[PDB]
Structure 1
Amino acid sequence: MNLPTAQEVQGLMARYIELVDVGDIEAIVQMYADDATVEDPFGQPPIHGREQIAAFYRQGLGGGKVRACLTGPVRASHNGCGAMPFRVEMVWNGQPCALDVIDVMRFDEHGRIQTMQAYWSEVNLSVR
């Protein structure tokens, strides 16, 4: 793939959420460029490269207990970038919880994620 068009960004970012939802860490990591950076949550030190990104997603998704779904359309640019709102359902203190997140992504000319920023904090964590 080339630098993704706006429509292609919409497709790639939706697929990323599907991979999070099923917990396919290997497929998530393969969507990232080999030297990609992740900031999650934004404000925390960036994570660099597929080895470190895989380890990160393994800790976050490896334990099971995680679902994710878009809560609105992917917003896409003409320069291979986009932003999406979604909700992660997981377990907090032994009960279900929901976390509202926005991921911002920049794709490279091979259609892989070069940078990702995940905007959320504890103000976005809700419980029953």
Structure 2
Amino acid sequence: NLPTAQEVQGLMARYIELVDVGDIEAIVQMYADDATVEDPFGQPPIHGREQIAAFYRQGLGKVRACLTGPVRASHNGCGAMPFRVEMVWNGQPCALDVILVMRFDEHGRIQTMQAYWSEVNLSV
């Protein structure tokens, strides 16, 4: 938890940009070795780089993503941000509203990623 609030905002805005462009390798590089992903939150934690990379490959491997509000950062290396994801479901264009909560480490890398959303946040 070394990054300042402003650095958190930058790191999280960057994350959205990478998701939006679909650079899986760049996204995976943002994580720390022991990082965990809970997406959607409530689902078992995903750990291990190979696993996290596989997670993003099945998700991003025409997906678009944008911030729908400013990043909310803390002074202990954590942040939360609202965004919308455009993808395809059941063979049809849809939109998903999500809120990502991340904890960064002393190296500026993602230690924990928690994405809140459910079926109610989906719109076809």
CA apart distance, 1:72: 0.1
How much has 1:50 moved relative to structure 2? Answer: 1.1
After TM superposition, the runs of 4+ consecutive aligned structure 1 residues lying more than 4 A away are: none
Unaligned runs of 5+ in 2: none
CA distance in 1, matches of 2:62, 2:54: 17
TM-score w.r.t. length of structure 2:
0.97
Tell me how far apart the structure 2 counterparts of residues 60 and 93 of structure 1 sit (CA, whole Å).
14
Q: Tell me, in whole angstroms, the C-alpha distance in 1 between the residues paired with 2:80 and 2:62.
A: 25
- Residues 22-61 of structure 1: matches in 2 within 5 Å? 22-61=21-60
Q: Give, in whole Å, the separation in 1 of the partners of 2:56 and 2:64.
A: 13
> What is the deviation of 1:24?
0.3
What is the aligned-residue RMSD (CA, Å)?
A: 1.0
* 1:61-101 CA-partner distances (Å, limit 9, x unpaired): 1xx52000000000000000000000000011222100000
Deviation larger for 93-102 or 81-90 = 93-102
TM-score (norm 1): 0.94
- Of 105, 110, 113, which aligns to 1:108? 105
Taking only the aligned residue pairs, the percentage that are identical comes to 99
Report how many residues are paired: 124
* SS of aligned partner of 1:56: helix
Give the C-alpha shift of residue 49 in structure 1: 1.9
* d(CA) in 2 for partners of 1:96, 1:69: 16
Give CA-to-partner distance per residue, 1:2-27, whole Å, 9 cap, x none: 81100000000000000000110000
Structure 1 residue runs without a partner (length 5+): none
